[PDB]
Design an enzyme around this catalytic site. Structure first.
Site, mmCIF file in Angstrom:
data_model
loop_
_atom_site.group_PDB
_atom_site.id
_atom_site.type_symbol
_atom_site.label_atom_id
_atom_site.label_comp_id
_atom_site.label_asym_id
_atom_site.label_seq_id
_atom_site.Cartn_x
_atom_site.Cartn_y
_atom_site.Cartn_z
ATOM 1 N N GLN A 39 0.800 -1.179 0.028
ATOM 2 C CA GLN A 39 0.069 0.026 0.172
ATOM 3 C C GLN A 39 0.846 1.154 -0.061
ATOM 4 O O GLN A 39 0.614 2.353 -0.734
ATOM 5 C CB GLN A 39 -1.003 0.159 1.216
ATOM 6 C CG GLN A 39 -1.996 -0.906 0.965
ATOM 7 C CD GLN A 39 -3.203 -0.800 -0.106
ATOM 8 O OE1 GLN A 39 -3.449 0.465 -0.617
ATOM 9 N NE2 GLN A 39 -3.329 -1.937 -0.784
ATOM 10 N N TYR A 66 -9.727 4.851 -11.456
ATOM 11 C CA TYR A 66 -8.899 3.861 -10.884
ATOM 12 C C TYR A 66 -9.228 2.342 -11.129
ATOM 13 O O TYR A 66 -10.215 2.141 -10.666
ATOM 14 C CB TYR A 66 -8.340 4.364 -9.500
ATOM 15 C CG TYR A 66 -7.229 3.562 -8.942
ATOM 16 C CD1 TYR A 66 -6.842 2.056 -9.256
ATOM 17 C CD2 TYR A 66 -6.413 4.089 -8.134
ATOM 18 C CE1 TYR A 66 -5.641 1.530 -8.462
ATOM 19 C CE2 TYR A 66 -5.258 3.517 -7.284
ATOM 20 C CZ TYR A 66 -4.795 2.316 -7.660
ATOM 21 O OH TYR A 66 -3.965 1.585 -7.165
ATOM 22 N N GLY A 68 -8.448 -1.399 -10.946
ATOM 23 C CA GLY A 68 -7.804 -2.508 -10.449
ATOM 24 C C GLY A 68 -7.528 -1.684 -8.953
ATOM 25 O O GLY A 68 -6.254 -1.853 -8.515
ATOM 26 N N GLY A 72 -7.539 -1.002 -1.941
ATOM 27 C CA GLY A 72 -7.407 0.355 -2.197
ATOM 28 C C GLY A 72 -7.388 1.348 -1.009
ATOM 29 O O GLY A 72 -7.551 2.456 -0.863
ATOM 30 N N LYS A 169 0.800 0.236 -14.690
ATOM 31 C CA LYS A 169 1.420 -0.951 -13.974
ATOM 32 C C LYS A 169 2.382 -1.301 -15.046
ATOM 33 O O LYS A 169 1.735 -1.605 -16.480
ATOM 34 C CB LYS A 169 0.408 -1.885 -13.619
ATOM 35 C CG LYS A 169 1.044 -2.871 -12.854
ATOM 36 C CD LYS A 169 0.234 -3.983 -12.564
ATOM 37 C CE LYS A 169 0.362 -5.073 -11.476
ATOM 38 N NZ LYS A 169 0.509 -4.413 -10.124
ATOM 39 N N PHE A 174 9.842 -11.261 -18.715
ATOM 40 C CA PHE A 174 10.978 -11.928 -18.763
ATOM 41 C C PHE A 174 11.650 -12.556 -20.076
ATOM 42 O O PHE A 174 10.729 -13.154 -20.847
ATOM 43 C CB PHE A 174 11.386 -12.801 -17.730
ATOM 44 C CG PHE A 174 10.938 -12.469 -16.290
ATOM 45 C CD1 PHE A 174 11.271 -11.294 -15.825
ATOM 46 C CD2 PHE A 174 9.915 -13.158 -15.608
ATOM 47 C CE1 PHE A 174 10.744 -10.550 -14.938
ATOM 48 C CE2 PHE A 174 9.155 -12.497 -14.560
ATOM 49 C CZ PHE A 174 9.617 -11.336 -13.954
HETATM 50 N N1 LIG Z 1 -10.666 -6.290 -15.557
HETATM 51 C C1 LIG Z 1 -10.563 -5.831 -14.404
HETATM 52 N N2 LIG Z 1 -11.269 -4.747 -14.020
HETATM 53 C C2 LIG Z 1 -10.850 -4.408 -12.871
HETATM 54 N N3 LIG Z 1 -10.054 -4.541 -12.036
HETATM 55 C C3 LIG Z 1 -9.234 -5.573 -12.426
HETATM 56 C C4 LIG Z 1 -9.350 -6.358 -13.768
HETATM 57 N N4 LIG Z 1 -8.539 -7.513 -13.866
HETATM 58 C C5 LIG Z 1 -8.145 -7.745 -12.508
HETATM 59 N N5 LIG Z 1 -8.331 -6.267 -11.748
HETATM 60 C C6 LIG Z 1 -8.129 -6.165 -10.446
HETATM 61 O O1 LIG Z 1 -6.625 -5.793 -10.444
HETATM 62 C C7 LIG Z 1 -6.360 -5.894 -9.013
HETATM 63 C C8 LIG Z 1 -4.914 -5.912 -8.714
HETATM 64 S S1 LIG Z 1 -4.294 -5.666 -6.957
HETATM 65 C C9 LIG Z 1 -4.680 -4.092 -7.161
HETATM 66 C C10 LIG Z 1 -4.405 -3.323 -5.826
HETATM 67 C C11 LIG Z 1 -4.998 -1.868 -5.447
HETATM 68 N N6 LIG Z 1 -4.509 -1.042 -6.564
HETATM 69 C C12 LIG Z 1 -4.580 -1.177 -4.213
HETATM 70 O O2 LIG Z 1 -4.692 -0.273 -4.144
HETATM 71 O O3 LIG Z 1 -4.879 -2.000 -3.201
HETATM 72 C C13 LIG Z 1 -7.334 -7.033 -8.168
HETATM 73 O O4 LIG Z 1 -7.997 -6.430 -7.061
HETATM 74 C C14 LIG Z 1 -8.086 -7.451 -9.307
HETATM 75 O O5 LIG Z 1 -9.233 -7.817 -8.923
#
Ligand SMILES: Nc1ncnc2c1ncn2[C@@H]1O[C@H](CSCC[C@H](N)C(=O)O)[C@@H](O)[C@H]1O
Ligand SMILES: CN1CN([C@@H]2O[C@H](COP(=O)(O)OP(=O)(O)OP(=O)(O)O)[C@@H](O)[C@H]2O)c2nc(N)[nH]c(=O)c21
Ligand SMILES: CN1CN([C@@H]2O[C@H](COP(=O)(O)OP(=O)(O)OP(=O)(O)O)[C@@H](O)[C@H]2O)c2nc(N)[nH]c(=O)c21
Ligand SMILES: Nc1ncnc2c1ncn2[C@@H]1O[C@H](CSCC[C@H](N)C(=O)O)[C@@H](O)[C@H]1O
Lengths: 291, 291
Positions: A39, A66, A68, A72, A169, A174
């Protein structure tokens, strides 16, 4: 002890001036040393990115989409920070997973429980219209096949949402698992303090001028370079104790954190950058429950 | 008679300095006045484009991948022109339809009977490797749905083939049949003499520097503009008799043709640009069997 004197830390990928052969044994080493370090990692990078937009006058009045975003937890800190600075922003947090309940009850923040696809992006674009959009993506599927699919979704995010700026992101697949060359948006490869010990992830920061969209091709040779530069940064640099850094914590990551935090705007007036940073860091750690 | 004095003709879309409301009744007017006018249209544009590449030193040693090449009668003229100039080029003509037999028996030209898809592009890329590629696309599916699909294929052509330059068929969908905004590669919008009477088609000419790829968004408002600028060019301009143009034919399209042909390199030395052009035009018309 592993000491050194540094002027500044590496802020962007391009600054890394050395490389090391990736040692697969590094994968078995401790990935994190602080609770809620992830976080913290996200909070600093996004505070860094958003403060820049504010500096360029493009934050105020924007809707931050935002994708994903869940859980959060750290996002609540970001929202409070700009809200308390008087910046007017709407947040739209979309993830199929559930958000931290601390995000509820704020009129300026809309939580959406949806996994976004191209079609959904089209509907929220039609629904956000005509607000200016700032995109932040942290979606996660692992495989190079997974990554490519994520990068492909992120580029469709920019093309449909057509944001004024974006933080994406970005971790290059690799070289030994290369599938095919691809394009990512052009932007600054922001390095991340408090990333996992051997992570090769950075955040791609872009600001969109005109109606043009510039992409850049990424090849396996680029993948080899990413691997070696990031391996050098992680194994060597991030393991340095910057002794000429007069700060309660001299470890490289705090030195690197200092440089991002010094760019953040506060209401309180401070006599030195050092006082502002200590303040912001104390504040950030208290919020995240990091000792 | 419809006379006027012009300095130069409109060479690019951006030069069109006026517009007219599109009159749907124009669709019932005679689209062509010359036999094999379409081969002529393609020949001039491609001679124009390729001569530029030669001028920039990027033609020699390249493989020209022409997708949507059949019948390709005019292509035999292009090939002979550069072959006779000593430029070393390999041609790879791909279409699911059959090519004009005049293209057979040339070691420097490979005819392929295949409708290309992304996967096939990948295999020819792997097979052309490591030659430098110059892409020319003239694929045709009509509907805005058809167009978008074509434009989407053309962008995948550039991303997979990763050419040093490209000429792409480009006609903006009509605003009244808008489906969605999209991106086309950034390039010069070359105008085409001898295009059908009311055609809004141009050729997108691009040269690729670095490893970047710049795209540009096209919206319905852009579509409205394309329609009006092109309608003005077709209805008004292309109908002018450039009386201060001392040439056997003063019609606008010949005036416009003169400016493209004056950029073409010949082995023969001429005392005036006018003599070279008359020569190239005579030559081109004889080849295509145009009186
Ligand atoms: N198509 C999509 N739309 C929305 N979120 C997505 C997604 N595919 C995966 N994700 C989300 O991407 C996330 C990655 S973890 C993200 C952590 C968050 N940014 C934080 O601040 O805590 C997961 O919660 C997952 O459900
Ligand atoms: C940095 N890494 C990591 N890694 C592989 O990636 C696996 C998962 O760790 P990771 O790369 O940190 O996961 P990631 O999805 O990137 O998340 P985050 O970023 O840390 C490891 O078990 C290891 O096999 C690598 N494999 C290769 N070939 N090259 C590299 O540079 C790396
Ligand atoms: C230039 N045109 C043409 N056109 C429509 O397009 C139909 C086919 O003619 P066209 O546009 O020349 O075909 P096209 O596929 O573009 O081939 P090429 O280019 O000439 C006409 O019957 C007419 O209905 C148009 N319809 C709208 N709304 N606006 C325009 O500007 C135009
Ligand atoms: N996927 C694809 N691959 C190859 N050619 C394609 C295509 N889809 C359509 N086309 C071709 O696009 C062409 C458009 S007409 C092209 C005329 C040609 N350029 C000339 O010089 O004469 C048709 O021959 C059609 O078969």
């Amino acid at each position: 002890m592993d000491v050194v004197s540094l002027d500044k830390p590496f802020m962007y990928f391009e600054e890394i001036d050395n490389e090391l052969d990736y040692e697969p044994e590094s994968a078995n080493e401790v990935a994190k040393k602080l609770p809620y370090q992830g976080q913290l990692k996200l909070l600093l990078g996004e505070l860094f990115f958003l403060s820049k937009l504010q500096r360029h006058g493009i934050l105020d009045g924007a809707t931050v989409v935002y994708i994903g975003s869940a859980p959060g937890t750290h996002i609540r800190y970001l929202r409070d920070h700009f809200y308390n600075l008087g910046v007017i922003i709407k947040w739209m947090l979309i993830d199929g997973r559930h958000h931290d309940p601390i995000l509820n009850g704020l009129r300026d923040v809309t939580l959406v429980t949806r996994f976004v696809d191209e079609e959904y992006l089209r509907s929220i674009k039609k629904q956000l219209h005509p607000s200016k959009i700032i995109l932040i993506s942290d979606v996660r599927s692992p495989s190079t096949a997974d990554l490519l699919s994520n990068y492909a979704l992120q580029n469709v995010m920019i093309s449909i949402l057509n944001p004024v700026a974006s933080s994406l992101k970005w971790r290059c697949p690799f070289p030994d698992q290369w599938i095919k060359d691809f394009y990512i948006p052009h932007g600054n490869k922001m390095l991340q303090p408090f990333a996992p010990s051997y992570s090769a992830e950075m955040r791609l920061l872009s600001i969109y001028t005109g109606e043009n969209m510039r992409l850049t091709r990424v090849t396996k040779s680029d993948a080899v370079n990413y691997e070696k530069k990031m391996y050098y940064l992680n194994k060597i640099v991030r393991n340095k104790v910057v002794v000429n850094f007069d700060y309660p914590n001299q470890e490289y990551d705090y030195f690197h954190m200092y440089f991002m935090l010094r760019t953040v705007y506060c209401n309180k007036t401070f006599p030195t950058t050092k006082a502002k940073v200590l303040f912001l860091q104390q504040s950030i750690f208290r919020f995240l429950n990091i000792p």
